[PDB]
Amino acid sequence: SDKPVAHVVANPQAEGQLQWLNRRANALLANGVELRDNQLVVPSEGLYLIYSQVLFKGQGCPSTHVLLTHTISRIAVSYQTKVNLLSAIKSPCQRETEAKPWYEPIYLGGVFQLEKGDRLSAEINRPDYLDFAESGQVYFGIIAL
Amino acid sequence: PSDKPVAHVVANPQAEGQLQWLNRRANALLANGVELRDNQLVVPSEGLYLIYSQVLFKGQGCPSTHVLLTHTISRIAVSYQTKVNLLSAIKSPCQAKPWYEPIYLGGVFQLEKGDRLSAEINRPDYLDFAESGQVYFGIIAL
Amino acid sequence: SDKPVAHVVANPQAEGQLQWLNRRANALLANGVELRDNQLVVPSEGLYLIYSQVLFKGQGCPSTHVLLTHTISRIAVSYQTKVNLLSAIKSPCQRETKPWYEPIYLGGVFQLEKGDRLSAEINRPDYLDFAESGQVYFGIIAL
Amino acid sequence: EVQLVESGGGLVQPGGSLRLSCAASGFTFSDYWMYWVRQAPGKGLEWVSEINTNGLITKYPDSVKGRFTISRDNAKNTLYLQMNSLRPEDTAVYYCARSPSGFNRGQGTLVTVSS
Amino acid sequence: EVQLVESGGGLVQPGGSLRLSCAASGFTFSDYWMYWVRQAPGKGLEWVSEINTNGLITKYPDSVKGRFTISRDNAKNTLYLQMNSLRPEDTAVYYCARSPSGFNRGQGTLVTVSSHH
Amino acid sequence: EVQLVESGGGLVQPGGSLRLSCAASGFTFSDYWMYWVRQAPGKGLEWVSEINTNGLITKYPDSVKGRFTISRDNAKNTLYLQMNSLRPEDTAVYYCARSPSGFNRGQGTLVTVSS
């Protein structure tokens, strides 16, 4: 169509970091949306649908209490202020210690009135736990409505 | 501009032990005819709507009992006030360190005008509404 | 609206299998979208928002570590190749042997071609709570 | 073709207990929030209970709160009202319904509370 | 230049076991569900196994169910078919593919199940 | 009516420790990512810490990494910087801000590190 759109996927080759990518196969960055500084830049004022998923994986439970967050934040052109739009927290481990693998996905989605030149960041707290190897697990998208 | 009916209402942080949706906030919407009435979103015209809601539950230590958490979006028909489940999940909280359970619901539904939508949970005493963007409820016409 | 749209729901009458249905009750299959071989069929080229939820329920933890997956996959018209668009995994149990519930929600925008097919599939149909309505669904809408 | 038949009504003295039952058919019971409503002599129809589809969400007016417990069994297409520590002012025809206005209510079951 | 090269085929006797292997290149392997298909002489190509990207979803026709096991190592870009309790009617050319219809298949590996060497 | 008031600034010796404090008012503290920035004499403004709304995401430039910890208390509308293994290269006016360019910063607080 002609609608501003993106669906970016985590770079599988990055190392313990969340790095958004516009790959050819089943990814999108079109109709004026740009990926600058791992951040989607809104090309025009209006309503957008904004969404993201991360999947965290761990081989067992460490001593310290583990808290996982995923967040979509808006950075305003006007001031460079950074407000949380969508977030969630997950408690993967309640005990410690063989070592069985654990998995915790987080999905965020909603509708926001945005200004041209606003940037959106999709950010986590434990990239050492991020399962970005396989595809379809880590992604970040907008589409103008 | 856009003239598509749209809402994105957020849990009142100053409310206490209940889920109260608010629209008169930054990074919230209620426009093109959608009303917030008796804690529920009112559909201003017939058609396809995308409906979504997220809640975050939190406790200071694994419950002493087998708690189940649920989140539901329900359709109340204009007449007959019939309440049907559109979207729902149930989460098992962890079987003192803090625990966190998000639930996300969304999908597309044909609605008649004056149909109401409620987004409701079962344990408001575990609902984490103090923080921004953890608890929301929206629709948009497609 | 004249846009391709589908919201199909789990069949409650099936046993240990995920079968998609078009009820007239808060379910959709319209404006050219077809349900064939348990896959949604795209009637025209374009951008589609694609989404799905499954709800897993188990009475107690088994002796064998369980991993649960939900995947939305695209089957291309030209070759019948099948690629993963959206996927997640959950580990419902950490020790053996009190019911447990696990939801997984998937969603995203994708460029699809006319005749491209979409499957929503899971690994453990025996743990799927499709008895109640609104817990298991699979939808697209052309944007 | 929706049909709700209520039962379990009777005479009880103040401080008594009663279990009302409601047998449903003609609709997908699991899809619908269900209600108990009542009609007292000379009074407006009054909803006394609401329950959601999985039974985990329940709502009550202050009039019956602490004393009335709505439950459902989706397998059995049956709705229940546990009524404890019943008061005379609870005396009324009780109905299950698909709305708090009492839509698809049946014949009702009578609960009389007198000393 | 998608290449799927099959190997591990041979002569085996009824009740025998064989591990087929498939070295993949020229695509993002962890993106695609993968298949095992076979052509037996004078028969149409038959799909015998399907596996999803993460390896937790596997499907098999009634003909081999319980006896064949498909698996994959995405780090090694390799697909495997463990074939147990082999029977003479399983004798055919075996291909790994991106489709049940045989797309991107290689030369294939010949599996002969005879009661005589 | 946005006001950020920094404090905890003072004179400390190398290898030393300071805790800077920041009182927020006039905005919803919980909504905004917050920042510590500093300015040494004759140097540009330099961001030293970024924290998200829940305090689980922290970022630092390599200049202060290992040594500085940013934290927050949303109930107290207060932001903190724990400064450890302090160096003479850390002496400056330290501000809290809603951007890394120093947006809505206050009088700042002065941290001097000498012998």
Residues in chain B with CB shorter than 8 Å from the CB of A106 are: 102
- Which residue, among A79, A83, A89, would best test binding to F if mutated, counting the most F CBs under 10 Å from its CB? A83
Range of the domain at D61: 3-113
Neighbours of B73 (CB within 10 A): 23
Closest by CA to E105, choosing from E15, E4, E1, is: E4
C-beta of residue B138 within 8 angstroms of C-beta of residue B7:
yes
Would you tell me which residues 28-57 of chain E have a C-beta closer than 8 angstroms to some C-beta of chain C?
31-33, 52-54, 56-57
A4 residue type, one letter: P
| Contacts B–F by Cβ distance under 8 A | 15
C-beta of residue A61 within 8 angstroms of C-beta of residue F8:
no
Query: Could you give the CA distance from residue D86 to residue C39 in angstroms, rounded to a whole number?
Result: 55
In total, how many domains does chain D have?
1
Closest-CA distance of chain C to residue B15, Å: 28
Nearest CA in chain E to C85: E31
Q: Tell me the three-class secondary structure of chain B, residue by residue.
A: CCCCCEEEEEECCCCCCCCCEECCCCCCEEECCCEEECCEEECCCCEEEEEEEEEEEEECCCCCCCCCEEEEEEEECCCCCCEEEEEEEEECCCCCCCEEEEEEEEEEEEECCCCEEEEEECCHHHECCCCCCCCEEEEEEC
**What DSSP assignment string belongs to A6-24?**
EEEEE-TTSSSS--EE--S
Our CA dihedral for E47, E48, E53, E54, rounded to 10 degrees, sits at 170
Nearest CA in chain E to A26: E31
First-to-final CA distance of chain F: 40
The burial class, CB within 10 Å (0-12 / 13-18 / 19+), for C49 is: buried
Q: C72 has which bridge partners?
A: C86, C120
Residues in chain C with CB shorter than 8 Å from the CB of E101 are: 79-80
Closest-CA distance of chain E to residue C121, Å: 8
Q: Which residues contact D76 (CB under 8 A, 6 or more apart)?
A: none
- Touching D: which chains, 3+ CB pairs < 8 A? B, C
Kindly state the DSSP code that residue D32 receives in the 8-state scheme. Answer: B
C-beta of residue C75 within 8 angstroms of C-beta of residue C39:
yes
Read off the CATH number of the domain in which F51 is found: 2.60.40.10
- Beta strand C137-142 with C5-10 is antiparallel
Tell me the two tokens of residue B74: 């329900």
| CATH classification number, B3-142, choose in 3.10.105.10, 3.10.20.30, 2.60.120.40, 3.40.50.1220 | 2.60.120.40
Query: Could you give the CA distance from residue B131 to residue B7 in angstroms, rounded to a whole number?
Result: 20
Spelled out in words, what is the top-level CATH class assigned to the domain C2-143? mainly beta
Closest by CA to F33, choosing from C112, A80, A32, E93, is: A80
Q: D96 has which bridge partners?
A: D36
Closest by CA to B115, choosing from C26, F77, C75, E54, is: C26
C-beta of residue D63 within 8 angstroms of C-beta of residue D97:
no
Report the residue count for chain E. 117
- Touching B: which chains, 3+ CB pairs < 8 A? A, C, D, F
Experimental method: X-ray
Would you tell me which residues 52-71 of chain F have a C-beta closer than 8 angstroms to some C-beta of chain B?
53-54
**3 state SS of C62:** coil
Q: Which residues contact C66 (CB under 8 A, 6 or more apart)?
A: C58, C91, C92, C93, C124, C127
Q: How far is CA F15 from the centre of its chain?
A: 18
E77 residue type, one letter: N
Closest by CA to F109, choosing from F49, F2, F36, is: F36
Query: Could you give the CA distance from residue C47 to residue F24 in angstroms, rounded to a whole number?
Result: 44
Fold for domain A2-145? Jelly Rolls (2.60.120)
Q: Which residues contact E42 (CB under 8 A, 6 or more apart)?
A: none
Residues in chain E with CB shorter than 8 Å from the CB of A25 are: 28, 31
In angstroms, this model's resolution equals: 2.6
Closest by CA to C49, choosing from D1, A141, B140, is: A141
Residues in chain A with CB shorter than 8 Å from the CB of E28 are: 25, 135
**What DSSP assignment string belongs to chain E?**
--EEEEE---EE-TT--EEEEEEEESS-GGGB-EEEEEEPTTS--EEEEEE-SSS--EE--TTTTTTEEEEEETTTTEEEEEE-S--GGG-EEEEEESSTT-TT--S-EEEEE-S--
C-beta of residue C40 within 8 angstroms of C-beta of residue C48:
no
Please state the domain extents for chain A: 2-145
Closest by CA to B15, choosing from B127, B139, B138, B134, is: B127
Query: Could you give the CA distance from residue A91 to residue A94 in angstroms, rounded to a whole number?
Result: 7
Q: Which residues contact D13 (CB under 8 A, 6 or more apart)?
A: D113, D114, D115
First-to-final CA distance of chain A: 12
**What DSSP assignment string belongs to A71-134?**
EEEEE-TTT--EEEEEEEEE---SS------EEEEEEEEEEEEE-TT-EEEEEES-GGGB--SS
Residues in chain A with CB shorter than 8 Å from the CB of E54 are: 134
C-alpha torsion sign, points D103, B107, A124, A131: positive
